[PDB]
Amino acid sequence: VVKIAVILPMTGGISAFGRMVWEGIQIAHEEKPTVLGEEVELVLLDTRSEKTEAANAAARAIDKEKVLAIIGEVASAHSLAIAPIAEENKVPMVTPASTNPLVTQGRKFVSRVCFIDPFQGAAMAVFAYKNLGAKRVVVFTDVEQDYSVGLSNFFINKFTELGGQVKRVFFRSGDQDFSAQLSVAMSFNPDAIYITGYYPEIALISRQARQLGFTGYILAGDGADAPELIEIGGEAVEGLLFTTHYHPKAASNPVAKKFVEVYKEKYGKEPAALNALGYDAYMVLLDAIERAGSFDREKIAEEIRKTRNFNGASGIINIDENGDAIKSVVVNIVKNGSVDFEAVINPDDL
Amino acid sequence: VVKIAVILPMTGGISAFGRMVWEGIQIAHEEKPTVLGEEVELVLLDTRSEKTEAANAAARAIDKEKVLAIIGEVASAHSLAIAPIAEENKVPMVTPASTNPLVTQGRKFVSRVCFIDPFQGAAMAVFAYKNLGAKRVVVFTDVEQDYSVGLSNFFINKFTELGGQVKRVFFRSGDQDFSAQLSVAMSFNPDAIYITGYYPEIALISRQARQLGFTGYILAGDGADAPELIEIGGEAVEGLLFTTHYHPKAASNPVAKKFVEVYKEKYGKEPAALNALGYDAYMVLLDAIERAGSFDREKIAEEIRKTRNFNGASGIINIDENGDAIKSVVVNIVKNGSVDFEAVINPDDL
Ligand SMILES: N[C@@H](Cc1ccccc1)C(=O)O
Ligand SMILES: N[C@@H](Cc1ccccc1)C(=O)O
C-alpha cells in the first residue's frame, strides 16, 4: 500500500542510465520487498530523457499517485526539475546518481547516495595535473546539461589553481558533428581533452578527435560510465579515463561483495556504478523508514540525513546534514573493450 | 584602449531584451565615454539568444579581446553560461537584469544591479494572495530557462506558505501550442495562471488561455517586460499583471528623472526597465573603476560590491556583499495597449 515513485530515463538519449539504475533497484526490492511490515510498491515512471517529462512525472507521482517517496533521477538537469516539486510537497527524494550540488542545496527533503561535483571535478583536475602531467586541457561542456556546466566549472577552478591552462568549447546534447569545437581544441595544442557531458556525445567526440590525429588523453566524468560508451566509441575510447563512483573489483564491505555476486548471477557480467547506486538509493530509503518507525514523511526525511556507517553496494554510505554522501571518486580506464580500475581518490587526498 | 564586452541577445528569440539594454548602455556611454582619463571602448557581442553562443562570446571576449570587464547577459541561463568564465579569469562582470541567485552565488567577480528571484517570486506570491485574493494558481514553467525554473520555485514556496494551492505545468522556449498545459490548467479551476518564462511564450499562452474562455488573472515575472508582449498578445494580455524593476512614472531620484527625459527625447516613448538597467550596469561599473583608482581587476571587482547610495536610472543602487542589489519590485499592468504602474513592493512589505 506503500508507494515509491521510481523516476528514471528508461527511453530516449540517456536510456542506458535508466536501465542500469532500474536493474539495481529491482535487485534491492526483491531482497527487501517490505518495510515496517508493509508491502512496498514501486511506481516506475519514464522521463524519456526529457526535462519536461521528468517534471511531469514528478508532478503526477505527487498529485495523482500520492507516493510516499521518490527515487530518481540520474541526470542532474532532470533531478533539478523534480527536486523542487518533492520539496514543495514534503515528499522525501533520494537520487542515486545526480552529482550537481544544487539538487540538495537549501532543501530538507532531497538527498543523494553519491558524491557531489566540486569533489568529482577537483579529483580529475588533480589526477590530470599530478598523475598524467597534463598542463593544457580543452574542456568540452554540454550547455544543455546542468551537470556538465557545473562539473566543467569545478574542474577548471581546481585545474587552473594548480597552474594548468584551459580552453573552453561548447556543444549541445544531441549534436553529431564536433568539427568546429575540435578545430578550436586542437589549435590550443592540448595534452588532454576533458568532456563533461554524457556517453552519446563523449563517444562521438572521441571518434572525431582520434580521426583528426589527436594522440593526447581523453578524460571525462561519470557521464561516460555506460557500456554504450565502448559500443559507440570502439578503438577511439581505448585509454579513455573517467571519474565514477565504483569499480566491482574494488568491492570491499559485505553488502558490496554480495551485490557483485548477485548481479553477476543474474546478468552474466560485472555490475557498474549505476547498478550499485540504484540498489543503495532503495536500501537507504528503506533503512531510513525503519529508523523513523512510521510513514511520517518529515521523520523519514530527517532519518535519510542521519544515515551513517551504512554498508551499501557502492561503498559505506554516510550522508551529511546537506543530504550529500561522503564518497570516494574512482578513476577507471577503458582497456581492451572493457573497464579497468585505475585509482581511488578519497576526499583527504586533495 | 579600455575595452568593455557588452554581451547581449541582439538577435534570436529574446532579441527585444538586447535591444532595450543596448539603448540604455549607449545613452550611458555617450554621457560618460571615458574613465580615469581613458577612452572606453564597447565591444558588442551578440549571443543570438543561445546558451552556446553566449558562452562562446564570453570565451572570445576574455581569450581574444582581452577585455577589462563584461556587461551582460539578460537571460539568467545565458548569464549562468558566462559567469563561470568571468570568474575563472578574474574579469569583473555586471549583469543588468539576470535575477537568478546562482549568477553571483559563490563568486567574487560577478555582480548585478537588480533584485534576485527569491524576492521577485515572493513579491508576486504575496500580491496574488493578499491583493488579488488568488488562492488557486497554475504555474507555467519553461524547463529550458534557469530563470523560469527558479522563479517558479520561489513563487510556489511563498504562495503555498501563505496557504495557496498550486498546480504545475511545463513547456519549452520556442513552443507554439500550449493546448495540453492549458487543458491541465483549466481542470484545476484556477483564479490565476502565473507564467515564469519570456514574452514570446507568455503572449502565446495568454492568447490561447483567453480563447479557451479563461477569465481569471494572468500573472508573469519580468520576462513579460518587452513591448513585444503587447504586440503579440493584443487583447489577450489586457489586464495582465507582472513584476518588474521599474516604471518611468515612478522615477524619483535626479538621475532617474533625467534618464526619462533623455530617453523620451531620443525615442519618443517612455523608457522601460531594461533601458534603465542597461544604463545602470554601465554607470555602476565606471563608478567602481573610479573608486578603484586604477584598472586592477581585483580592485574593480571589490569596488562593485561596495556600491552604496548610487543614484541610478532604475532607482538607488546598493549592492550587497554577495553582488546582489537591494531593489524594490514594481508590479505593472497592461491597460489599453500600454503599461501602467500598479504597485511597489519594498523588501520590508513582506
Ligand atoms: N552524475 C551524473 C549522472 C550519472 C551518474 C553516474 C553515472 C552516469 C551518470 C549527473 O549528475 O548528471
Ligand atoms: N530577470 C530575467 C531577465 C529579464 C529582466 C528584466 C526584463 C526582462 C527580462 C532573467 O533573469 O532571465
B109 vs A59: CA distance, rounded Å: 37
Given a contact cutoff of 8 angstroms between Cβ atoms, the answer to whether B91 and B118 are in contact is no
For A130, the grid coordinates are: 599530478
Given a contact cutoff of 8 angstroms between Cβ atoms, the answer to whether A263 and A275 are in contact is yes
Judge residue A162's burial from the number of C-beta atoms within 10 Å of its C-beta, 0-12 exposed, 13-18 middle, 19 or more buried: middle
A337: left (phi over 0), alpha (psi -120 to 50) or beta: left
Contact (CB<8Å) B172/A88: no
What residues have CB less than 8 Å from A296, skipping those under 6 apart?
Answer: none
Q: How many CB pairs under 8 A join A and B?
A: 63
**Residues of B numbered 129-148 whose beta carbons fall under 8 angstroms of chain A's beta carbons: which are they?**
141, 143-144
Q: After which residues does chain A break, using C–N > 2.5 Å? A: none
Beta strand pairing call for B2-8 and B38-46: parallel
Domains observed in chain A: 1-116+246-328 (3.40.50.2300), 117-245+329-350 (3.40.50.2300)
Between helix A199-211 and helix A179-187 the angle, nearest 10°, is: 60
Cβ-Cβ contacts under 8 Å, B56 against chain A: 170
A306 vs B266: CA distance, rounded Å: 63
Q: In 3D, which of B6, B63, B56 has the Cα closest to residue B285?
A: B6
B236 vs B349: CA distance, rounded Å: 31
- Asked whether A98 lines ligand 1 (CB < 6 A), one says yes
For B254, the grid coordinates are: 535626479
B107 vs B58: CA distance, rounded Å: 16
Distance B35 CA to ligand 1 centre (A): 47
Cis amide leading into B73 (omega within 30): yes
Given a contact cutoff of 8 angstroms between Cβ atoms, the answer to whether A161 and A114 are in contact is no
Cβ-Cβ contacts under 8 Å, A55 against chain B: 141, 143, 168, 170
Between helix A15-31 and helix A273-292 the angle, nearest 10°, is: 40
Residues B174-205 as b/e (b if ≥16 CB within 10 A, e otherwise) read ebeebeebbebbbebebbbbbbbbbbbbbbbb
SS3 at position B246? coil
Tally of residues, chain A: 350
Distance A10 CA to ligand 1 centre (A): 15
In one-letter notation, the amino acid at residue A195 is I
Distance A56 CA to ligand 1 centre (A): 21
SS3 at position B116? coil
* Resolution in angstrom units: 1.9
Q: In 3D, which of B201, B111, B110 has the Cα closest to residue B148?
A: B201
The residue behind cell 569545437 is A181
In one-letter notation, the amino acid at residue A91 is V
The shortest C-alpha distance from B300 to chain A (Å) reads 21
Pocket of ligand 2, candidates B222, B327, B339: which has the most ligand atoms within 8 Å of its Cβ, to mutate? B222
The shortest C-alpha distance from A182 to chain B (Å) reads 14
Given a contact cutoff of 8 angstroms between Cβ atoms, the answer to whether A225 and A197 are in contact is no
Q: What is the DSSP string of A2-42?
A: EEEEEEE--SSTTHHHHHHHHHHHHHHHHH--EETTEEEEE
Q: In 3D, which of B332, B154, B126 has the Cα closest to residue B242?
A: B332
The H or E element containing residue B31 is helix B15-31
Helix, strand, coil percentages (3-state) for chain B, rounded to 5, are 45, 20, 30
Judge residue A25's burial from the number of C-beta atoms within 10 Å of its C-beta, 0-12 exposed, 13-18 middle, 19 or more buried: buried
Q: Write B233-238 long-range contacts (CB < 8 A, 24+).
A: B233/B202, B233/B203, B233/B206, B233/B207, B233/B334, B234/B207, B235/B210, B236/B203, B236/B206, B236/B207, B236/B209, B236/B210, B236/B211, B237/B202, B237/B203, B237/B206, B237/B334, B238/B334, B238/B335, B238/B336, B238/B337
In one-letter notation, the amino acid at residue B283 is M
Q: In 3D, which of A145, A152, A236, A241 has the Cα closest to residue A198?
A: A145
SS3 at position A70? strand
Alpha-carbon separation of residue B67 from A75, B6, B83 (angstroms): 35, 10, 14
Beta strand pairing call for B2-8 and B34-35: unpaired
The shortest C-alpha distance from A189 to chain B (Å) reads 15
B206 vs B234: CA distance, rounded Å: 9
Q: In 3D, which of A83, A71, A58, A92 has the Cα closest to residue A22?
A: A71
Pocket of ligand 1, candidates A23, A82, A95, A99: which has the most ligand atoms within 8 Å of its Cβ, to mutate? A99
- Nearest CB neighbour to B172, from listed A52, A166, A172: A52
